[PDB]
């Protein structure tokens, strides 16, 4: 995954009698959370240059609609990553906090693999899948 | 004229509890933050006329 | 070049320089 990349971070390994959440763990995580965050940084910051330059550039009545469009893609994109960042934030508080490997819902444990495909999941399947089935039939 | 919370502030504030300059200030920048992230260049001039 | 001149409507003439490039910003609600 480009993510496990970004940090020169490799996927964990729980040996035979490690404790739970330990030290060496926590330590594991908040590399592959800046870096990720320092990658997410680095998009929002890149985009904005060549978003820059367009704007400046008038296009022709005709072009405006196709330039247009590949802005609109781009924006709404970038608020996801804002949002992406506010919840690795959120996350990274969770390490800080020593509150982190639990589901929110039920006290019951998060997996360690299972975490670092996803480091900022919250809950576990059962609640996690619960929750998105309420969603369909609370919203449609 | 402290940030007693925080979020956006309103200008009508900012003009009372700061002064004339400093709502000028605020509103000039803010705007420009919206043209120059865009890379369209407007002379503060301008828009202080409309200030 | 030089300095404005006395009796330019410069109320105008500033006006029209903000509007114009508003085509080019984007009208949704960028959020930064
Ligand atoms: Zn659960």
Known sequence: ?140 | ?51 | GHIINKGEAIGVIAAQSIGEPGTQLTMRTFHI
């Not at chain 2, 402290?2 to 009372?16: F, K, N, Q, T, W």
């Not at chain 2, 200030?25 to 202080?48: A, F, P, S, T, W």
Request: proline content about 4%.
């Open chain 1, 1 to 140: 995954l480009s993510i496990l990349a970004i940090a020169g971070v490799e996927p964990y390994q729980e040996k035979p009698g490690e404790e739970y959440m330990n030290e060496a763990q926590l330590a594991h995580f908040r590399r592959i959370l800046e870096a990720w965050r320092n990658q997410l940084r680095d998009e929002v910051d890149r985009t904005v240059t060549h978003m820059q330059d367009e704007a400046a550039n008038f296009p022709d009545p005709v072009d405006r609609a196709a330039q247009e469009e590949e802005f609109s893609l781009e924006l709404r994109n970038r608020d996801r990553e804002r949002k992406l960042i506010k919840k690795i934030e959120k996350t990274l508080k969770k390490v800080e906090d020593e509150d982190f490997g639990y589901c929110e819902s039920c006290g019951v444990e998060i997996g360690i693999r299972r975490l670092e495909a996803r480091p900022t999941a919250d809950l576990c399947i059962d609640c996690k899948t619960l929750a998105e089935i309420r969603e369909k039939q609370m919203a449609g």
């Open chain 2, 1 to 51: 004229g402290d940030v007693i919370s925080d979020g956006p502030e309103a200008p009508h504030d900012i003009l009372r509890l700061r002064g004339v300059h400093a709502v000028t200030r605020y509103i000039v920048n803010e705007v420009q933050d919206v043209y120059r992230l865009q890379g369209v260049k407007i002379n503060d001039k301008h828009i202080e006329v409309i200030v």
